[PDB]
Design a protein around this ligand. Structure first.
Ligand SMILES: Nc1ncnc2c1ncn2[C@@H]1O[C@H](COP(=O)(O)OP(=O)(O)OP(O)(O)=S)[C@H](O)[C@H]1O
Ligand SMILES: [Mn+2]
Length: 266
């Protein structure tokens, strides 16, 4: 049914192909598990779970999942996921090709992401992996959040929250944090913490305060600082408790209004 075509992109887990649905005549994105990882149960499982978790979401700002299955290739069974096709670019790409967005644009985009996440949080779903690569902007400039993660067991990493690097409990406020990180990098052109390993970056995430955005990049403002740093506060209790709260504050900043976030001085 699906005539696959060009490679749209590469992820740490999969190859995503543009394809044509020949029964409905629409372009779709087909996510195919990396050949070599299919043999590892943990990954096959992860892949399938994410699929079923994401199909439970239906919002204009969230990439819809349409179908599943497994191609019975000569090598073995490659599971794949059929989804709504976004013709556009991830924020990572945007940052890598065009530099930091204008404050207002950043605000608009992140605010849309908030709606996606809030809708999700309401149908009881933590994303878990909010990062620049998991948010796309369409040719027609719609924001689209994707690659929703899944509750895992217990005994990148550059946008994970503190409670994630420790083995603590995870809820909506962690999406709030990591989103904070996205906004940060998208305002300044850099992720808030960098280093020579995951470990050290994990250290920074839970130990060192971020440099205020206005202090890493020109024409930002103290109010943005406020919002960004409240989003990136270490203890979930001191952050925006909900996506909507964060969004409301972003809206305040977008207009000429002062945000409710505690103030930040340089
Ligand atoms: N719905 C889509 N429409 C168009 N391109 C897409 C779409 N989904 C993914 N891509 C592209 O293919 C990519 C990877 O998709 P992912 O779902 O993030 O794969 P992944 O294996 O989960 O990567 P991770 O985050 O390392 S596990 C890019 O970041 C894209 O440019
Ligand atoms: Mn993924």
């Amino acid at each position: 049914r699906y005539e696959l075509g060009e490679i749209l992109g590469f992820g740490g887990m999969s190859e995503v192909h543009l394809a044509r649905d020949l029964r409905l005549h629409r372009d779709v994105a087909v996510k195919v598990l990396r050949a070599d990882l299919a043999r590892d149960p943990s990954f096959y499982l992860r892949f399938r779970r994410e699929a079923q978790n994401a199909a439970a979401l239906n919002h204009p700002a969230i990439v819809a999942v349409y179908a599943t299955g497994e191609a019975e290739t000569p090598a073995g069974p490659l599971p794949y996921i059929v989804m709504e096709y976004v013709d556009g670019v991830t924020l990572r790409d945007i940052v890598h090709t065009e530099g930091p967005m204008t404050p207002k644009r950043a605000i608009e985009v992140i605010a849309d992401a908030c709606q996606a996440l809030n809708f999700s949080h309401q149908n009881g779903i933590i994303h878990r992996d909010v990062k620049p690569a998991n948010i796309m902007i369409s040719a027609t400039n719609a924001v689209k959040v994707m690659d929703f993660g899944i509750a895992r067991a217990i005994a990148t990493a550059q946008y994970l929250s503190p409670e994630q690097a420790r083995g603590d409990s995870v809820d909506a406020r962690s999406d709030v944090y990591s989103l904070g990180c996205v906004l940060y990098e998208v305002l300044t052109g850099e992720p808030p913490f960098t280093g020579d390993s995951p470990v050290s970056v994990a250290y920074q995430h839970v130990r060192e305060d971020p440099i205020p955005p206005s202090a890493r990049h020109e024409g930002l403002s103290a109010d943005l600082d406020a919002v960004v740093l409240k989003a990136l506060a270490k203890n979930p209790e001191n952050r925006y408790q909900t996506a909507a709260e964060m969004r409301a504050d972003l809206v305040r900043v977008h207009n000429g209004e002062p945000p409710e976030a505690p103030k930040v001085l340089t």
